Amino acid sequence: VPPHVPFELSGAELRDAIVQYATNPIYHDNLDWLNHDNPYRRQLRPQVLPHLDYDKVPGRENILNYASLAVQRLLTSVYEADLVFFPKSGLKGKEEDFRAFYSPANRALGERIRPALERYAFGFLDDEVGTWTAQSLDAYLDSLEQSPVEKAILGSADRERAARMWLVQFAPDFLSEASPMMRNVLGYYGPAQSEWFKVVIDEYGYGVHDTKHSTLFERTLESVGLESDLHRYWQYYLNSSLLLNNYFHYLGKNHELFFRYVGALYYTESSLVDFCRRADHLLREVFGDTVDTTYFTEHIHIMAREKIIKPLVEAHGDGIIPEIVRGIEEYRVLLEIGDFDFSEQIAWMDAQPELKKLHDPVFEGLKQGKVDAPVAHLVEPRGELSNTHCHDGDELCHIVSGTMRFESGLGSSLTLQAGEGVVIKRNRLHGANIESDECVYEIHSVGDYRKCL
Amino acid sequence: VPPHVPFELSGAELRDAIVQYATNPIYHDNLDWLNHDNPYRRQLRPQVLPHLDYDKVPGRENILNYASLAVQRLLTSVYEADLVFFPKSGLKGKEEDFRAFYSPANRALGERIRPALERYAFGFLDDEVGTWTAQSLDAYLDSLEQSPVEKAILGSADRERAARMWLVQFAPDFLSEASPMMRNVLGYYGPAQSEWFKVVIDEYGGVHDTKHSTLFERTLESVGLESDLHRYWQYYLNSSLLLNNYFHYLGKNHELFFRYVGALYYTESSLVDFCRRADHLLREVFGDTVDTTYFTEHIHGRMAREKIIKPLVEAHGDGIIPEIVRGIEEYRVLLEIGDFDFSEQIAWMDAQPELKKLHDPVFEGLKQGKVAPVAHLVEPRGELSNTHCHDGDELCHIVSGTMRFESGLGSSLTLQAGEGVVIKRNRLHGANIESDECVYEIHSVGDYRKCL
Ligand SMILES: [Fe+2]
Ligand SMILES: [Fe+2]
Ligand SMILES: [Fe+2]
Ligand SMILES: [Fe+2]
């Protein structure tokens, strides 16, 4: 028997393999802000991946840096190759993009880099979350006010724009609802398999398309002027949103974390009533009667501890309890990241007029060397659309000549003319496009922008 | 934007990558003929994989050669990594085999070689199966004696052994029923998704006792067979794995989604005749004790042409009709291979006493130089050669010792000094040593009839 060479992929061979998967033309930069009914095109900005270090796994203080957002976009596209998508208007015309996403090359390229991507995205959870008995697990299970999402949407200068930015975050999740959960009911195991499929049955709405939860979220999006084609608002997905959705494909694809999904299954269903009640009350508060919230209220109309957790512990032993606990705590940490990330973006979107005015005083500090900041000069023609991204330090955009559309979120835009600019806060999703025949502008890497005031 | 380097894996780098995935100790040779309640260990015989050419894809005339059987075993192991398995007696004790099967290394190594394995396994179908209209398709759909399976089991010298060999072939399929089809209901598309999930619902029952996999459990336990995967892995036929791997092939690769739409029509619309013949066959062989509720419950075909095929062609155009037909015809070719492979295996098992007698005359023909390469072997007690096959007939001649020659589930021969057996090509077979030592020769006679 020949010796086994352990699987290894790191260093430059990892960067080349990640670039290889992402250089597929369906992943290149979009010329518009939205995807036009094409579920096979996902913008991964491949021109930046060669310059990132995937060997250096970041901590929680740095999971909002661009490399983590770049990895989230790669992981979403890698996971979703197992899911069936077709445009709302049909496959006719998009056959070539359909073949470039579902091909023997695309999945193998993404599956070979998945272990390394799955460690840059979730490696920090080891520092954020012993032996257990069924008795200790019970008490921990028994020990489980305005939400941060309510404060940001209700306290926003534009409540409707804030809520619409919140709804599109659930597009990859709710429109393919229970797709990650179904990864566990494949195979052959005990009665817990039928019990888990019982959740999927309700999650798919008995087979009827009208009561399917994915169709319910369509009417929710269509009631506020938003579309339901994936992935229309891909460029408006926050880092934390992809992190939350990718976590269940992470738990669902890798069956060694099957008991971690069992823990997160309890926590979601036991917190789902309060979440759906808050979403229904908040949406009707922002939009009124015109909003369709049947998706959330149906969940209140609708078994895991006795019918799944208990028989699994009796059959597979007490050694699986820490993983059930770890799945609960890992998910709670991720929810905290979403509340912080989403609240920072809304405040960043609402403060756009003042951060544009703030460009002046920051610009004077640099001219007086209050800080020493690297500068880059750029000349781009109209239609050079920088896809949405973020930076690890604050930047000062200064427009010398021309006209630029600075994007900070769905419905949040600034027109920047000659002599004007904007202060770009770090870790915030943002992009830009040129609206004039030519635009000359500068980018100042000031680190902390408050050091220039 | 850096230029795109197209995915490439062939030649020596392909063999190294296949050996790399299969050298996981959970894939090593089993010391017994059966797996004892461990769904994470599958025998892939990795010490033979370096000596196969995966670049030369064989045609249908050679898809029963051993190289195809080796690829079938790997593809099943790669496909089933997406499936949840737990032992019947619990995990407690299989933790490291459980971690050795469900790990990022096992999945990435198997997914990297999957495109090449799928070209070796299904490449012949390109030579075995234009534009279409909805009307041309309807007419093709409207135009679709004992079965070969009945003739083989009822014509067998041991009908009970014949039927038990037939039941274990469906273990990876029936015990994980609707698992390949459920790969298509993940995602986000039109009403056709809800129609497909309704078919999956019937296969799962939602209740565990009425779940169709549980019905097949009581079927196997009623004839003395166990329901833990993969106990009879060494007794799985090439064509059996080929049929099961075909639906994971269609389910994993969503570019073949409409090929599955064709295969969905044919199976459910032919499953009634299949289940009725199986119910009649099992009751004739076993009698009152056999539980055939699995087959009678199945007795989807009409919901699939109107509620799935019709709106899909209306939504995606006529260009998907050729793939729907291809899924139908590709499935019919594989059933033809299963019927031939299974009929040949039973005839090979029933003819064991005569093939032992036939060793004598084949052996003198070699003694007259009428035909053969020879290999001498000295193996100790407990040397269990896992089941495999060869591309030509071989003559096993025993000089000294005792050997248990395995030819199938319940088919065995004791081979002593001076005796032997004629090993027919492409037939699943194995061997074990029953004496403190066994010295024997293996003669590669090609066609054994040239020695008579
Ligand atoms: Fe739901
Ligand atoms: Fe930027
Ligand atoms: Fe069924
Ligand atoms: Fe042999």
Q: Residues near B129 by Cβ (< 8 Å), separated by ≥ 6?
A: B326, B329, B330, B333
Whether residue A256 and residue B102 make contact (CB cut-off 8 A), yes or no, is yes
A270: Cβ contacts below 8 Å, ≥ 6 apart: A144, A304
Contacts with B, A 78-137, CB within 8 Å: 80-86, 88, 90-92, 95, 98-99, 102-105, 107-109, 111-112, 114-115, 118
Q: Which of B367, B360, B407 is nearest to B385 (CA)?
A: B407
Question: How far is residue B113's CA from residue B115's CA, in Å, rounded to a whole number?
Answer: 6
User: With an 8 Å Cβ cutoff, is A20 touching chain B?
Assistant: yes
Distance separating alpha carbons of residues A73 and A18, to the nearest angstrom: 12
User: What is the rounded distance in angstroms from the CA atom of residue B388 to the CA atom of residue B377?
Assistant: 17
DSSP H or E segment with residue B263: helix B257-286
Q: How far is CA A231 from CA A79, A173, A175, A221, A234, in A?
A: 14, 11, 10, 13, 5
Residue with tokens 């021309």: A402
The CA dihedral of A332, A333, A334, A336, to the nearest 10 degrees, is: 90
Residue type, A246: N
Give the minimum alpha-carbon distance from B183 to chain A in angstroms, rounded to a whole number: 8
Residues 252-281 of B with CB under 8 A from A: 252-255, 257
- In this structure, are residues A238 and A328 in contact, taking their beta carbons and an 8 Å threshold? no
Quick check: bond before A28 cis, omega within 30? no
SS3 B434: coil
Partner-chain contact B115 A104, CB within 8 Å: yes
**Ligand nearest to the backbone CA of A425:** 2
DSSP B128: T
The residue type found at A301 is H
Chain A residue whose CA is closest to B175: A188
CA-CA-CA-CA torsion for B15, B21, B27, B29, nearest 10 degrees? 30
Residue B5 to residue A24, Cβ atoms within 8 A: no
DSSP state of B68: H
Q: Indicate if the alpha-carbon torsion angle B51, B56, B60, B61 is positive or negative.
A: negative
For tokens 């695309």, the residue is A106
Extended strands (E) in B292-410: 374-380, 385-388, 393-400, 403-408
Q: Quote the CA–CA distance of B26 and A47 in Å, as a whole number.
A: 41
Cβ neighbours of residue B278 closer than 8 Å, sequence gap 6 or more: B149, B292, B295
- Which residues 38-77 of chain A have a CB within 8 Å of chain B? 39, 46-47, 50
Please name which of B213, B219, B369 lies closest in space to residue B290, comparing C-alpha atoms. B219
Query: Which chain A residue has the Cα nearest residue B108?
Result: A112
Distance CA A85, CA B185 (A): 10
Q: Does A225 touch chain B if contact means CB atoms closer than 8 Å?
A: no
Q: Which residues contact A13 (CB under 8 A, 6 or more apart)?
A: none
Q: HSE of B282 in the Cβ direction (CA atoms, 13 Å)? A: 23
Instruction: Give the Cα separation of B367 and B120 in Å (integer).
Output: 39
- Is A1 within 8 Å of B83 when comparing Cβ atoms? no
Nearest CA among B213, B218, B195, B182 for reference residue B298:
B213
B203 is in an annotated binding site: yes
| CA A222/CA A230 separation, integer angstroms | 14
Count other Cβ atoms within 10 Å, centred on residue A328.
22
| Helix then strand then coil, % of chain B, to nearest 5 | 55, 10, 30
Pairing status of strand A404-409 against strand A412-416: antiparallel
Instruction: With beta carbons under 8 A apart, name residues in chain B contacting A80.
Output: 187
Can the peptide bond before residue A299 be classed as cis, meaning omega within 30 degrees of 0? no
Q: How many CB atoms lie within 10 A of CB A93?
A: 13
> In Å, how far are A64, A68, A78, A206 from A387, measured between CA atoms?
17, 16, 20, 40
In angstroms, how far apart are the furthest CA atoms of chain B? 72
B247 and B200 Cβ atoms separated by less than 8 Å: no
Q: How far is the CA of B372 from the centre of ligand 4 (A)?
A: 16
Q: Do B187 and A20 touch (CB under 8 A)?
A: no
Starting at the edge strand that comes first in sequence, how are the strands of the sheet with B374-380 ordered? B374-380, B437-446, B393-400, B420-423
DSSP result, B171-235:
HHHHTTTTTTGGGGSSEE-STHHHHHHHHHHHHH-SSSSSSHHHHHHHHHHTTT---STTTTGGG
Per DSSP, the three-state class of B376 is strand
Q: Does A307 touch chain B (CB under 8 A)?
A: no
Does the distance separating the beta carbons of A187 and B80 come in below 8 Å? yes
B30 three-state secondary structure: coil
C-alpha to C-alpha distance for B184 and A204, rounded to whole angstroms: 13
User: How far is the first Cα of chain A from the last one, in angstroms, to the nearest whole number?
Assistant: 69
Q: Residue B145 annotated as binding? A: no
Is the distance from CB of B27 to CB of B19 less than 8 angstroms? no
**Distance from the A256 Cα atom to the nearest Cα atom in chain B, whole angstroms:** 5
Classify the phi-psi angles of A87: left when phi > 0, otherwise alpha if psi is within -120 to 50, otherwise beta.
Answer: beta
Residue B198 · residue A200 · CB < 8 Å: no
Return the SS3 of B388: strand
Q: How far is A83 from chain B (nearest CA, A)?
A: 4
Q: Which of B188, B311, B330 is nearest to B256 (CA)?
A: B330
Q: How far is CA A374 from the centre of its chain?
A: 30
CB nearest to A108's CB, from B7, B85, B257: B7
Nearest to B60 by CA among B119, B149, B118, B127: B127
Residues 6+ apart with CB under 8 A from A252: A180, A181, A182, A183, A184, A261
Give the residue from B419, B355, B357, B364 showing the smallest Cα distance to B393: B355
Which residues are B433's β-sheet partners? B403
Inter-chain contact A183–B82, Cβ cutoff 8 Å? yes
DSSP-derived letter for residue B369 is T
Q: How many CA atoms lie within 13 A of B320 on its CB side?
A: 28
List the structure tokens of A225.
């002027």
Question: Which residues in chain B have their CB less than 8 angstroms from residue A191's CB?
Answer: 208
Q: Which ligand is nearest to the CA of A211?
A: 1
Phi, psi of B17, rounded to the nearest 5 degrees = -70, -35
CA dihedral A361, A366, A369, A375 (to 10 degrees): 170
The C-alpha atoms of residue A236 and residue A221 are separated, in whole angstroms, by: 15
Nearest residue, CB atoms, B255 vs list A103, A179, A201: A103
CA distance B110 to B78: 5
Q: Are A373 and A444 in contact (CB under 8 A)?
A: yes
* Contact between B177 and B219 (Cβ < 8 Å): no
In terms of CA atoms, which chain B residue is nearest residue A250?
Answer: B104
Resolution for this model in angstroms, one decimal place? 2.5
Distance from CA of A393 to the nearest CA of B (A): 24
Q: Are A212 and B194 in contact (CB under 8 A)?
A: yes
Cα gap B10→B53, rounded to integer Å: 10
Give the closest residue to B394 by CA, choosing from B347, B448, B438.
B448
The answer to whether A408 and A414 have CB atoms below 8 angstroms apart is yes
Q: Give the C-alpha separation, B294 to B187, whole Å.
A: 30
Enclosing H/E stretch for B295: helix B293-298
For residue A99, the chain B residue with the least C-alpha distance is B255
Q: List Cα–Cα distances, B318 to A100, A317, B329, in angstroms.
A: 20, 54, 18
Where b means 16+ CB within 10 Å and e means fewer, B117-137 reads bbebbbebbeeeeeebeeeeb
Q: Which residues of B touch A183 (CB under 8 A)?
A: 82, 186
Instruction: Give the mutation candidate from B1, B21, B227, B244 for the A interface (greatest A CB count, under 10 A).
Output: B1
Among the partner-chain residues B3, B83, B207, the one whose CB lies closest to the CB of A187 is B83
In the numeric block, the tokens 């060999």 are attached to B165
Q: How many Å apart are CA B267 and CA B20, to the nearest integer?
A: 36
User: Residue B50, CB half-sphere, CA atoms under 13 Å: how many?
Assistant: 8
Residue showing tokens 């991720």:
A334
For A39, nearest residue in chain B (alpha carbons): B188
Q: Minimal CA–CA distance to A450: which of A353, A345, A358, A375? A: A358
Q: Which residue of B has its CA nearest to A44?
A: B1
Contacts of B83 in chain A (CB under 8 A): 186-188, 255
What burial class does residue A59 get, using C-beta atoms within 10 Å of its C-beta: 0-12 exposed, 13-18 middle, 19+ buried?
exposed
Using a CB-CB cut-off of 8 Å, the residues of chain A touching B187 are: 80, 83-85, 176, 179
Residues, CB within 5 angstroms of ligand 3 (ion) = B 203, 212
Closest CA to A247 of A21, A63, A8: A63
Ligand 1 center from residue A204 Cα (angstroms): 8
Q: Tell me which ligand sits closest to the C-alpha of residue B299.
A: 3
Q: From chain A, pick out residues whose CB is under 8 angstroms from the CB of B4.
A: 20, 23-25
- Strands of the sheet with A394-401, listed across from one edge: A375-381, A438-447, A394-401, A421-424
> Chain A contacts of B197, Cβ < 8 Å?
204, 207
Closest in A105, A176, A253 to B6, CB measured? A105
Residues 154-183 of B with CB under 8 A from A: 175-176, 179, 182-183
- Cβ pair B445, B362 in contact under 8 A: yes
Q: Is A299 annotated as a binding residue?
A: yes
Question: In terms of Cα–Cα distance, which of B106, B354, B392, B177 is closest to A256?
Answer: B106
State both tokens at B105.
Answer: 């290394």
Tell me the CA–centroid distance for residue B187 and ligand 1, in Å: 14
- Write a three-state SS string for chain A: CCCCCCCCCCHHHHHHHHHHHHCCHHHCCCCCCCCCCCCCCCCCCCCCHHHCCCCCCCCHHHCCCHHHHHHHHHHHHHHHHHCEECCCCCCCCCHHHHHHHCCHHHHHHHHHHHHHHHHHHHHHHHHCCCCCCHHHHHHHHHCCCCCHHHHHHHCCCCHHHHHHHHHHHHHHHHCCCCHHHHCCCCEECCHHHHHHHHHHHHHHHHHCCCCCHHHHHHHHHHCCCCCCCCCCCHHHCCHHHHHHHHHHHHHHHCHHHHHHHHHHHHHHHHHHHHHHHHHHHHHHHHCCCCCCCHHHHHHHHCCCHHHHHHHHHHHHCHHHHHHHHHHHHHHHHHHHHHHHHHHHHHHHHHCHHHHHHCHHHHHHHHHCCCCCCCEEEEEEECCCCEEEECCCCEEEEEEEECCEEEEEECCEEEEECCCCEEEECCCCCEEEEECCCEEEEEEEEEECHHHHC
DSSP B392: S
Residue with tokens 């003929």: B33
With 0-12 / 13-18 / 19 or more C-beta atoms within 10 angstroms meaning exposed / middle / buried, residue B10 is: exposed
> Quick one: which of A245, A242, A247 has its CA closest to A257?
A247
With beta carbons less than 8 A apart as the criterion, state whether A40 and A96 touch: no
Distance between Cα B102 and ligand 1 center (Å): 27
Q: What is the spatial distance between Cα B91 and Cα B38, in angstroms, rounded to a whole number?
A: 9
**Which ligand sits nearest to residue A214's alpha carbon?**
1
Ligand 4 centroid vs B388 CA: distance in angstroms?
7
The end-to-end CA distance of chain B, in Å, is 69
Nearest CB to A176; choose among B182, B188, B252: B188
Pairing type for strands A375-381 and A421-424 reads unpaired
CA distances (Å), origin B195, targets A134, B252, B314:
41, 19, 15
Q: Find the residue in B nearest to A115 (Cα).
A: B104
For residues A230 and A175, is the Cβ–Cβ distance under 8 A? yes
